[PDB]
Enzyme design. Sequence first.
Site, PDB file in Angstrom:
ATOM      1  N   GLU A 154       0.816  -1.229   0.000  1.00 37.75           N
ATOM      2  CA  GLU A 154       0.000   0.000   0.000  1.00 37.75           C
ATOM      3  C   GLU A 154       0.842   1.268   0.000  1.00 37.75           C
ATOM      4  OE1 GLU A 154      -2.745  -2.616  -0.554  1.00 37.75           O
ATOM      5  OE2 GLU A 154      -2.865  -0.486  -1.018  1.00 37.75           O
TER       6      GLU A 154
ATOM      7  N   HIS B  79       1.948   2.620  -3.238  1.00 37.61           N
ATOM      8  CA  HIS B  79       0.931   3.464  -3.905  1.00 37.61           C
ATOM      9  C   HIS B  79       0.886   4.916  -3.358  1.00 37.61           C
ATOM     10  CE1 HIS B  79      -0.828   0.220  -6.262  1.00 37.61           C
ATOM     11  NE2 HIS B  79      -1.317  -0.475  -5.247  1.00 37.61           N
TER      12      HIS B  79
ATOM     13  N   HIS C 101       1.061  -0.782 -10.181  1.00 38.40           N
ATOM     14  CA  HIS C 101       1.355  -2.209 -10.131  1.00 38.40           C
ATOM     15  C   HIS C 101       2.399  -2.627 -11.154  1.00 38.40           C
ATOM     16  CE1 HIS C 101      -2.683  -2.910  -8.037  1.00 38.40           C
ATOM     17  NE2 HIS C 101      -1.709  -2.910  -7.144  1.00 38.40           N
TER      18      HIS C 101
HETATM   19  C1  LIG Z   1      -5.630 -12.430  -1.616  1.00 39.02           C
HETATM   20  N1  LIG Z   1      -6.197 -11.222  -2.222  1.00 39.02           N
HETATM   21  C2  LIG Z   1      -5.525 -10.479  -3.112  1.00 39.02           C
HETATM   22  O1  LIG Z   1      -4.373 -10.744  -3.492  1.00 39.02           O
HETATM   23  C3  LIG Z   1      -6.254  -9.248  -3.664  1.00 39.02           C
HETATM   24  C4  LIG Z   1      -6.969  -9.617  -4.984  1.00 39.02           C
HETATM   25  C5  LIG Z   1      -7.268  -8.430  -5.909  1.00 39.02           C
HETATM   26  C6  LIG Z   1      -6.224  -7.689  -6.506  1.00 39.02           C
HETATM   27  C7  LIG Z   1      -6.486  -6.658  -7.436  1.00 39.02           C
HETATM   28  C8  LIG Z   1      -7.793  -6.366  -7.769  1.00 39.02           C
HETATM   29  C9  LIG Z   1      -8.848  -7.088  -7.181  1.00 39.02           C
HETATM   30  C10 LIG Z   1      -8.583  -8.111  -6.257  1.00 39.02           C
HETATM   31  N2  LIG Z   1      -5.319  -8.154  -3.873  1.00 39.02           N
HETATM   32  C11 LIG Z   1      -5.276  -7.102  -3.051  1.00 39.02           C
HETATM   33  O2  LIG Z   1      -6.031  -6.973  -2.062  1.00 39.02           O
HETATM   34  C12 LIG Z   1      -4.264  -5.992  -3.435  1.00 39.02           C
HETATM   35  C13 LIG Z   1      -3.168  -5.827  -2.338  1.00 39.02           C
HETATM   36  C14 LIG Z   1      -2.204  -6.977  -1.967  1.00 39.02           C
HETATM   37  C15 LIG Z   1      -1.115  -7.122  -2.965  1.00 39.02           C
HETATM   38  C16 LIG Z   1      -1.564  -6.749  -0.621  1.00 39.02           C
HETATM   39  C17 LIG Z   1      -5.144  -4.699  -3.596  1.00 39.02           C
HETATM   40  C18 LIG Z   1      -6.169  -4.911  -4.716  1.00 39.02           C
HETATM   41  S1  LIG Z   1      -7.431  -3.667  -4.803  1.00 39.02           S
HETATM   42  C19 LIG Z   1      -6.814  -2.768  -6.162  1.00 39.02           C
HETATM   43  C20 LIG Z   1      -6.916  -3.138  -7.495  1.00 39.02           C
HETATM   44  C21 LIG Z   1      -6.396  -2.229  -8.414  1.00 39.02           C
HETATM   45  C22 LIG Z   1      -5.831  -1.067  -7.854  1.00 39.02           C
HETATM   46  S2  LIG Z   1      -5.991  -1.177  -6.024  1.00 39.02           S
HETATM   47  C23 LIG Z   1      -4.303  -3.480  -3.916  1.00 39.02           C
HETATM   48  O3  LIG Z   1      -3.664  -3.415  -4.929  1.00 39.02           O
HETATM   49  N3  LIG Z   1      -4.357  -2.475  -3.069  1.00 39.02           N
HETATM   50  O4  LIG Z   1      -3.362  -1.486  -3.132  1.00 39.02           O
HETATM   51 ZN   LIG Z   2      -1.918  -2.468  -5.175  1.00 36.31          ZN
END
Ligand SMILES: CNC(=O)[C@H](Cc1ccccc1)NC(=O)[C@H](CC(C)C)[C@H](CSc1cccs1)C(=O)NO
Ligand SMILES: [Zn+2]
Length: 158
Positions: A114, A117, A123
Site C-alpha cells: 500500500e 501506492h 502495479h
Molecule cells: C488475496 N487477495 C488479493 O491478493 C487481492 C486480490 C485483488 C487484486 C487486485 C484487484 C482485485 C482483487 N489483492 C489485493 O487486495 C491488493 C493488495 C495486496 C497485494 C496486498 C489490492 C487490490 S485492490 C486494487 C486493485 C487495483 C488497484 S488497487 C491493492 O492493490 N491495493 O493497493
Molecule cells: Zn496495489
Amino acid sequence: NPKWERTNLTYRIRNYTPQLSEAEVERAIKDAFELWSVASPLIFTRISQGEADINIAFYQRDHGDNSPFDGPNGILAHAFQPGQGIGGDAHFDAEETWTNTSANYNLFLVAAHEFGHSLGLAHSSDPGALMYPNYAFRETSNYSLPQDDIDGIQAIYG
Ligand SMILES: CNC(=O)[C@H](Cc1ccccc1)NC(=O)[C@H](CC(C)C)[C@H](CSc1cccs1)C(=O)NO
Ligand SMILES: [Zn+2]
Ligand SMILES: [Ca+2]
Ligand SMILES: [Ca+2]
Ligand SMILES: [Zn+2]
C-alpha cells in the site's frame, strides 16, 4: 506522474485491529515504511495526533470513500496516490485476519504494498515484485525491497 514535493512525511495510525497488539501493529507499519526509506530520499515521522500526510486506518465495507471493502478475502486494502487530503492515505479491510506470521494475512507485507501506492508507484507485472497485484507470502525476518521495486521509486525520486 504524481509524487510528493516534500521529503519528510508524517503518518498517523487512526485506529487498530484487535487481532494484533497495538505494539505489533506499530512495528508492522514502522518496518514497512523503512523498506522504502532505505531506497529513496524520504523520511517518515509518526505523529500521535493532528493532521498527518498519510492516514492509516482499518475500515469495513462502506467507509466514506466510494471504494467499499468486500468482507473476508478478496480485496485486502487500498491506498491513494500522492496528494492533498485523502491523497496518500491507506485503508485496510477490518474484516480480514491480520497476522505477523506466515498465516493469511501478514500485515507488514500488505502494508509495504500500500505504501508503494501512497508514494506514487503503480502495479508491476513482475510476479517477484512487491508491487505485483496479488498477495503472496515471502519471508519477513530480514526482508528487503525487490529490485524491480527499487527501480520504481528511484525512477520517481532518486
Ligand atoms: C488475496 N487477495 C488479493 O491478493 C487481492 C486480490 C485483488 C487484486 C487486485 C484487484 C482485485 C482483487 N489483492 C489485493 O487486495 C491488493 C493488495 C495486496 C497485494 C496486498 C489490492 C487490490 S485492490 C486494487 C486493485 C487495483 C488497484 S488497487 C491493492 O492493490 N491495493 O493497493
Ligand atoms: Zn496495489
Ligand atoms: Ca493524506
Ligand atoms: Ca476483503
Ligand atoms: Zn478506502
